[PDB]
Design an enzyme around this catalytic site. Structure first.
Site, mmCIF file in Angstrom:
data_model
loop_
_atom_site.group_PDB
_atom_site.id
_atom_site.type_symbol
_atom_site.label_atom_id
_atom_site.label_comp_id
_atom_site.label_asym_id
_atom_site.label_seq_id
_atom_site.Cartn_x
_atom_site.Cartn_y
_atom_site.Cartn_z
ATOM 1 N N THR A 159 0.766 -1.234 0.000
ATOM 2 C CA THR A 159 0.000 0.000 0.000
ATOM 3 C C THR A 159 0.793 1.277 0.000
ATOM 4 O O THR A 159 0.594 2.131 -0.868
ATOM 5 C CB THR A 159 -0.985 -0.068 1.200
ATOM 6 O OG1 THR A 159 -1.818 -1.203 0.999
ATOM 7 C CG2 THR A 159 -1.796 1.146 1.265
ATOM 8 N N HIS A 420 -0.916 -9.491 -0.560
ATOM 9 C CA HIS A 420 -0.366 -8.842 -1.790
ATOM 10 C C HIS A 420 1.078 -8.395 -1.459
ATOM 11 O O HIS A 420 1.508 -8.479 -0.304
ATOM 12 C CB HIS A 420 -1.262 -7.698 -2.236
ATOM 13 C CG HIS A 420 -1.526 -6.726 -1.125
ATOM 14 N ND1 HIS A 420 -0.659 -5.697 -0.845
ATOM 15 C CD2 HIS A 420 -2.442 -6.749 -0.121
ATOM 16 C CE1 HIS A 420 -1.090 -5.048 0.228
ATOM 17 N NE2 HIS A 420 -2.180 -5.649 0.685
HETATM 18 C C1 LIG Z 1 -3.714 8.389 8.248
HETATM 19 N N1 LIG Z 1 -4.694 7.716 7.353
HETATM 20 C C2 LIG Z 1 -4.287 7.432 6.065
HETATM 21 O O1 LIG Z 1 -3.165 7.732 5.706
HETATM 22 C C3 LIG Z 1 -5.267 6.696 5.156
HETATM 23 N N2 LIG Z 1 -4.710 6.688 3.815
HETATM 24 C C4 LIG Z 1 -3.901 5.497 3.416
HETATM 25 C C5 LIG Z 1 -2.508 5.840 2.988
HETATM 26 C C6 LIG Z 1 -1.455 4.986 3.488
HETATM 27 C C7 LIG Z 1 -0.122 5.217 3.049
HETATM 28 C C8 LIG Z 1 0.235 6.243 2.133
HETATM 29 C C9 LIG Z 1 -0.778 7.054 1.639
HETATM 30 C C10 LIG Z 1 -2.155 6.877 2.042
HETATM 31 C C11 LIG Z 1 -3.110 7.814 1.367
HETATM 32 C C12 LIG Z 1 -4.640 7.455 1.492
HETATM 33 N N3 LIG Z 1 -5.321 8.419 0.658
HETATM 34 C C13 LIG Z 1 -5.546 8.137 -0.702
HETATM 35 O O2 LIG Z 1 -5.248 7.036 -1.186
HETATM 36 C C14 LIG Z 1 -6.204 9.223 -1.562
HETATM 37 C C15 LIG Z 1 -5.243 9.538 -2.826
HETATM 38 C C16 LIG Z 1 -3.829 9.526 -2.425
HETATM 39 C C17 LIG Z 1 -3.414 10.104 -1.226
HETATM 40 C C18 LIG Z 1 -2.056 10.109 -0.767
HETATM 41 C C19 LIG Z 1 -1.137 9.469 -1.602
HETATM 42 CL CL1 LIG Z 1 0.551 9.429 -1.043
HETATM 43 C C20 LIG Z 1 -1.521 8.900 -2.820
HETATM 44 C C21 LIG Z 1 -2.863 8.948 -3.222
HETATM 45 CL CL2 LIG Z 1 -3.463 8.241 -4.745
HETATM 46 C C22 LIG Z 1 -5.121 7.626 2.894
HETATM 47 O O3 LIG Z 1 -5.860 8.524 3.198
HETATM 48 ZN ZN LIG Z 2 -3.520 -5.010 2.171
#
Ligand SMILES: CNC(=O)CN1Cc2ccccc2C[C@H](NC(=O)CCc2ccc(Cl)cc2Cl)C1=O
Ligand SMILES: [Zn+2]
Ligand SMILES: *[C@@H]1O[C@H](CO)[C@@H](O[C@@H]2O[C@H](CO)[C@@H](O[C@@H]3O[C@H](CO[C@H]4O[C@H](CO)[C@@H](O)[C@H](O[C@H]5O[C@H](CO)[C@@H](O)[C@H](O)[C@@H]5O[C@H]5O[C@H](CO)[C@@H](O)[C@H](O)[C@@H]5O)[C@@H]4O)[C@@H](O)[C@H](O[C@H]4O[C@H](CO)[C@@H](O)[C@H](O)[C@@H]4O[C@H]4O[C@H](CO)[C@@H](O)[C@H](O)[C@@H]4O)[C@@H]3O)[C@H](O)[C@H]2NC(C)=O)[C@H](O)[C@H]1NC(C)=O
Ligand SMILES: [Ca+2]
Ligand code: NA
Ligand code: NA
EC number: 3.1.4.39
Length: 806
Positions: A159, A420
């Site tokens: 992720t 994954h």
């Molecule tokens: C604290 N809570 C979280 O972090 C929840 N979280 C999961 C997460 C975990 C690890 C890295 C990033 C993210 C980002 C994820 N947002 C998204 O995917 C929306 C689109 C996006 C946003 C940021 C990035 Cl770098 C790339 C994209 Cl495409 C988000 O909000």
């Molecule tokens: Zn997972």
């Protein structure tokens, strides 16, 4: 410390983050345990739920409600997303016919179509077809917009590396998020899924989309959502932000769903339990689209529906244990699961030795379900080595399996059925891309592509100049109705020399011999024409590669092949030849087995010598243009020129000779002729980029002949295979490889068998893009075709994966 006594009154989901100890009210305050005391009461209202019902229509505004159905809710921008449907007789977006969006249709005050990125964790590519019956809103985005059948994530297919790749356009080795867990030996710090180290900005390199936007005056919604904010509230917050006044309103937004990954881990990718999380994601899309429709934005906003990686069937019984291989298992630290990374448990242990670890993990058990590599030997297409957080020893784990250190790790940390992280070419790891909006094409299917390309497009959608990244800008212009990015081909830096016959045979003292002194105005003028390039159009089909750095090289022409010969590296940078479907394979004749011939166009001082090979007990040689595919016995002598020779370990020559003797002809047969460009690669610092001379760590003993780390081939034909490769009017088809130049075949556990049982398998593992080769060689291919330049960029980013049907 946070002084949580401040208030979120009028601050709910504020876009600027306030600094400590002032209490926060942004969509991340929960994750830092820093929200103001009244954040839940004010900002996370739930009363009466998320949907208007008939009896709420026209209600007296009650500010306690999660969302509103009162007459003022449109101007306040906080109606339930279904308000106009329940209360104003409107249709749900999903129920409307799709109609082409030829131009943006935006409310006044909108300076550009906003972009909304709808990010779904663990959304396996085949969910788009397999779950289509339960995903009507997503199916409408997909069918009416622009979609790929799948999008290839980056390795590891985890992720954090993938989301940060999507936001930056960078490989994880470049952005620095090289796994969900990491140890940085310079920081002496650990990054974990759980805990507070991960919020330290020093981990995160490059420039993500929200930073690129802000620096260029384009405002951004917050891209990160605390897990406890329900999805309905995330959608409502985005819709509220989109009702901000013009000067305050962001132009780019992100939604995130932890599903389907969360359930996929528990139930497997296709568990019966998986239908419900797909239904729930679809309902959330429906909320967004209905919400956009209410705001008159559904034909204004560009929406990207995108996943980070897929999900495979993995259960705890399919776990390989290092304790069944290693005597010293307590001396190592393993990062485990669907990949392995190993390093010494203590830097004070001078009995740790990576070579004995690798050897103990190599081809030890018949069905063994992981393969060890020093990171520099991993397939170059993974681009997974140039970062100090990537341990030297890597285990590539077979799909459906785990690796762990000891059995007690797996039961005393099994109910999980999905995971994954595997090789990013594995079909179960592929994920989704749909784009829908005025800027995207209408009802258009595009071939699969890599998620490293998306940042450039997201920049295009927003009028931003992207930061330096690993996409190839223009390679996705075919996804776009407008805002394409029209690059120019890079300028050639070094022009070649075209040497004629300049040296007498006796000026050479190379220690080579050839039985060729065996001897006509008919045929002689003809062979002079060949040396001047009279067959060059048939062997150099797409123009000569351009050299994009400063060096000294010669173009050498021959009947059967053309080469660009480096005077600095003493061998060709590239060798180009065409093999028709009718070509015949022949042997190297007995009297020519050891023939190497000086090249009277090239000085002795810029030639290789045979003595260096005789004296280097580890190193032999091969040829770039294959003597097996000579057009005639006479032309065959050109294949033994000293300028066509390259240094090859005997174990490598097994692979190379089988490729040249058997596989080239097979491809020409199957593809209706092929054009082949082959050459050496030097990448001793494993940065994915062409080495300079002073980075070369190995030479043929006693000589200045540099040893390649890899040999490549680019194999081009007509996409319409009814036309032969050399008379192709239309789009091209390509497969390429970057084979590691290794002194053993330890990577191939079946290598004691005949090459027909293992060579092609090796080559498939080392499949590559032409763009990968460009970075590794400073050459630019396909300079003279009849195709548009963006089409060529797409072709250069193509990867032939050899996986069956998705
Ligand atoms: C604290 N809570 C979280 O972090 C929840 N979280 C999961 C997460 C975990 C690890 C890295 C990033 C993210 C980002 C994820 N947002 C998204 O995917 C929306 C689109 C996006 C946003 C940021 C990035 Cl770098 C790339 C994209 Cl495409 C988000 O909000
Ligand atoms: Zn997972
Ligand atoms: C994929 O796309 C990316 C992006 O385009 C490509 O990466 C670029 O490659 C360039 C060449 O390798 C590189 O340019 C160098 O920049 C150096 C300055 O470094 C900082 O500034 C930039 C710009 O803001 C910044 O992004 C950097 O970020 C890196 O490092 C930080 C902190 O360490 C990380 O948080 C971040 O994630 C990133 O790390 C990654 O890159 C570095 C390389 O910089 C790796 O070490 C990491 O492992 C990781 O992969 C930095 O904060 C600059 O110093 C360099 O200049 C040296 O060499 C040139 C030769 O031209 C010369 O002018 C100088 O002499 C200098 O040499 C001196 O230093 C040497 C090393 O100590 C020493 O040996 C000498 O004797 C000299 O003293 C260089 O110009 C650029 O940084 C990256 N950018 C990024 C974001 O990665 C990538 O190549 C593409 N991949 C493929 C396969 O195509
Ligand atoms: Ca290099
Ligand atoms: Na030798
Ligand atoms: Na072997």
């Amino acid at each position: 410390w946070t002084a949580t006594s401040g208030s979120c009154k009028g601050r709910c989901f504020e876009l600027q983050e306030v600094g400590p100890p002032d209490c926060r009210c942004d969509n991340l305050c929960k994750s830092y345990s820093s929200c103001c005391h009244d954040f839940d009461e004010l900002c996370l209202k739930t009363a009466r739920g998320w949907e208007c019902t008939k009896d709420r229509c026209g209600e007296v505004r009650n500010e306690e409600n999660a969302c509103h159905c009162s007459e003022d809710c449109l101007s306040r921008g906080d109606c339930c997303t279904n308000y106009q449907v329940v209360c104003k007789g409107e249709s749900h977006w999903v129920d409307d016919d799709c109609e082409e969006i030829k131009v943006p249709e935006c409310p006044a005050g909108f300076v550009r179509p906003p972009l909304i990125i709808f990010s779904v964790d663990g959304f396996r590519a085949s969910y788009m077809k397999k779950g289509s019956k339960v995903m009507p809103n997503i199916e409408k985005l997909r069918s009416c917009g622009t979609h790929a059948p799948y999008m290839r994530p980056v390795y590891p297919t985890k992720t954090f590396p993938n989301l940060y790749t999507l936001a930056t356009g960078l490989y994880p080795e470049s952005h620095g998020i090289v796994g969900n867990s990491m140890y940085d030996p310079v920081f002496d710090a650990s990054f974990h899924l759980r805990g507070r180290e991960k919020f330290n900005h020093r981990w995160w390199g490059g420039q993500p989309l929200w930073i690129t936007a802000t620096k260029q005056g384009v405002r951004a919604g917050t891209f990160f959502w605390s897990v406890s904010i329900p999805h309905e509230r995330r959608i409502l917050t985005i819709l509220q932000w989109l009702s901000l006044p013009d000067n305050e309103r962001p132009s780019v937004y992100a939604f995130y769903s932890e599903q389907p990954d969360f359930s996929g881990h528990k139930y497997g990718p296709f568990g019966p339990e998986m239908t419900n999380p797909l239904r729930e994601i679809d309902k959330t899309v429906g909320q967004l689209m209905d919400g956009l429709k209410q705001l008159r934005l559904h034909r204004c906003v560009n929406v990207i529906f995108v996943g980070d990686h897929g999900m495979e069937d993995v259960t705890c019984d399919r776990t390989e244990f290092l304790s069944n291989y290693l005597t010293n298992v307590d001396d190592i630290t393993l990062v485990p699961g669907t990949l392995g990374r190993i390093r010494a448990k203590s830097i004070n242990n001078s009995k740790y030795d990576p070579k004995t670890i690798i050897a103990a993990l190599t081809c030890k058990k018949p069905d063994q379900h992981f393969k060890p590599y020093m990171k520099q030997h991993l397939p170059k297409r993974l681009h997974y080595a140039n970062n100090r957080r990537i341990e030297d020893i890597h285990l590539l784990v077979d799909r459906r399996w785990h690796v762990a250190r000891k059995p007690l790790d797996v039961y005393k940390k099994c109910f999980f059925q999905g995971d994954h992280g595997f090789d990013n070419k594995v079909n179960s790891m592929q994920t989704v891309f749909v784009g829908y909006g005025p800027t995207f094409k209408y009802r258009t299917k595009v071939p699969p592509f890599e998620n490293i390309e998306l940042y450039n497009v997201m920049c295009d959608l927003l009028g931003l100049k992207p930061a330096p990244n690993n996409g190839t800008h223009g390679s996705l212009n075919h996804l776009l109705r407008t805002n394409t990015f029209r690059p120019t081909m890079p300028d050639e830096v070094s022009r070649p020399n075209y040497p004629g016959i300049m040296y007498l045979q006796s000026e050479f003292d190379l220690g080579c011999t050839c039985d060729d002194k065996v001897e006509n105005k008919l045929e002689e003028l003809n062979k002079r024409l060949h040396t001047k390039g009279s067959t060059k159009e048939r062997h150099l089909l797409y123009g000569r590669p351009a050299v994009l750095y400063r060096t000294s090289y010669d173009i050498l022409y021959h009947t059967d092949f053309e080469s660009g010969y480096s005077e600095i590296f003493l061998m060709p940078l590239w060798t180009s030849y065409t093999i028709s479907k009718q070509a015949e394979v022949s042997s190297i004749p007995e009297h020519l087995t050891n023939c190497v011939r000086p090249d009277v166009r090239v000085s002795p001082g810029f030639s290789q010598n045979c003595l260096a090979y005789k004296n280097d007990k580890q190193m032999s040689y091969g040829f770039l243009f294959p003597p097996y595919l000579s057009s005639s016995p006479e032309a065959k002598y050109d294949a033994f020129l000293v300028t066509n020779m390259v240094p090859m370990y005997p174990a490598f020559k097994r692979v190379w000779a089988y490729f040249q003797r058997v596989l080239v002809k097979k491809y020409a047969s199957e593809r209706n002729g092929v054009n082949v460009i082959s050459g050496p690669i030097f990448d001793y610092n494993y940065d994915g980029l062409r080495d300079t001379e002073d980075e070369i760590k190995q030479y043929v003993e006693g000589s200045s002949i540099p040893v390649p780390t890899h040999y490549y081939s680019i194999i081009t034909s007509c996409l319409d295979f009814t036309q032969p490769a050399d008379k192709c009017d239309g789009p091209l088809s390509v497969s390429s490889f970057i084979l590691p130049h290794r002194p053993d075949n330890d990577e191939s556990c079946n290598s004691s068998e005949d090459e027909s049982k293992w060579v092609e398998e090796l080559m498939k593992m080392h499949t590559a893009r032409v763009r990968d080769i460009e970075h590794l060689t400073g050459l630019d291919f396909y300079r003279k075709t009849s195709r548009s330049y963006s089409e060529i960029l797409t072709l250069k980013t193509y990867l032939h994966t050899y996986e069956s049907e998705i």
